[PDB]
């Protein structure tokens, strides 16, 4: 018997977010960023920064009790890159390694229908 | 455009060979045929 969170891995520019939520979407669990692990302000979008960020999220979520994670990668959307950078795959590799069962990898990046 | 004309020649060749192969070639299911 396993229970499921939802990753919502944000592969932004100049930053990376990982925060697993229970699969409604309200009760977020352990928001981390790329900034709050590294100390340089130059590579707060580092793949290594996202790696240990996802490691700390995996530790806190195993502490709470969720074992599998439906993972959803979101790029910055809008009229911008529309496609995950390197930090998304870095966090994905990290929390796929770190003892956490992974389900239903997707892409929830917004598409504009030709906005401004 | 050369690649387009080449792909059309490939498709015409494939269709001529397919037509050549086409030209050279229980009770309840008998009642339940034709569907």
């Amino acid at each position: 018997s396993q229970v499921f969170g939802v990753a919502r891995i944000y592969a932004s520019f100049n930053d990376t977010f990982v925060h697993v939520t229970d699969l409604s979407g309200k009760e977020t669990i352990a928001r981390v960023t790329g900034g709050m692990k590294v100390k340089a302000d130059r590579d707060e979008s580092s793949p290594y920064a996202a790696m240990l960020a996802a490691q700390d999220v995996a530790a806190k979520c195993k502490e709470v009790g969720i074992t599998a994670v439906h993972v959803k990668i979101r790029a910055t959307g809008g009229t911008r890159t529309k496609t995950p950078g390197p930090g998304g795959q870095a966090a994905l590799r990290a929390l796929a390694r770190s003892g956490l069962r992974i389900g239903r990898i997707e892409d929830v990046t917004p598409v504009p229908s030709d906005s401004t | 455009t050369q690649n387009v004309i080449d792909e059309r020649k490939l498709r015409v060749q494939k269709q001529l060979d397919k037509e050549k192969n086409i030209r050279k070639r229980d009770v309840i299911e008998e009642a339940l045929s034709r569907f």
């Binding site: 229970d22 409604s24 979407g25 009760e27 590294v38 389900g103 997707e106 | 059309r8 037509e19």
Partner: protein, 242 residues
């Protein structure tokens, strides 16, 4: 970030150290409607069941976007995730109902290619209940067998005919049904084959899908009807011993 960066006049406001909320949170599990199989879809944190913004009414608004392969156990539709609105909380089990449906975007982004034209349709239709749906439909031109030309384009006066007949027949398929019946006829993907059978006369029409059902107005609660969609239940005694 670190120690050498900045204080930035926002860290002077002090931190309000620890609340440890996961010792206070509470686990519920979700029961999907009985049109599907495997109605247990997972668990949800809420809050502690106290008064003054209680749990049973801080609940009952949310949605969950579960996958249809996770509901049916069959990987033939790994796409087409649905959204269940949690509606009636009843004894640790969130009884939910249907709220929407959408394709995972990789499926349609791999379906659409060039050298074919795609058709869209969408109607606002009331069911036999008082739900109203902006139900959608996507369609694609089939490259006919024994074709030669690369194009396979629709004449754009066939497009009005295909869109008219597809809006007419799925308007009929909604209006002759209730919402539970609409889910139980949308799950084994049968209005797609109905569109293809009733529309293969005009054009060859590669794979048809519906890809979106958006609810826009809900009738009422009808607690008894929602309990009828799952199974009955009567919460009764536990021993006092004091």
């Amino acid at each position: 970030v670190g120690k050498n960066k900045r204080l930035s006049k926002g860290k002077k406001g002090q931190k309000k150290r620890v609340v440890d909320p996961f010792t206070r949170k509470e686990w519920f599990d979700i029961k999907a409607p009985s049109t599907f199989e495997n109605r247990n879809v997972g668990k949800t944190l809420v809050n502690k069941s106290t008064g003054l913004k209680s749990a049973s009414d801080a609940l009952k608004g949310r949605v969950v976007e579960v996958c249809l392969a996770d509901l049916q156990g069959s990987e033939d539709h790994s796409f087409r995730k649905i959204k269940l609105r949690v509606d009636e909380v009843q004894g640790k089990n969130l009884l939910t109902n249907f709220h929407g449906m959408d394709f995972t975007t990789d499926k349609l982004r791999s379906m659409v290619r060039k050298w074919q034209t795609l058709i869209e349709a969408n109607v606002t239709v009331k069911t036999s209940d008082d739900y109203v749906l902006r139900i959608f439909a996507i369609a694609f031109t089939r490259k006919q067998a024994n074709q030669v030309k690369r194009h396979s384009y629709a004449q754009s006066s066939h497009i009005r005919a295909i869109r008219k007949v597809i809006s007419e027949i799925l308007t009929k398929e909604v209006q002759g049904s209730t919402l539970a019946q609409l889910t139980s006829k949308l799950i084994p993907e049968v209005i797609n084959k109905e569109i293809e059978n009733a529309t293969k006369d005009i054009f060859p029409l590669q794979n048809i899908h519906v890809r979106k059902v958006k609810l826009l107005k809900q009738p009422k609660f009808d607690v008894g009807a929602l309990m009828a969609l799952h199974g009955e239940g009567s919460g009764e005694e536990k021993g006092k011993k004091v």
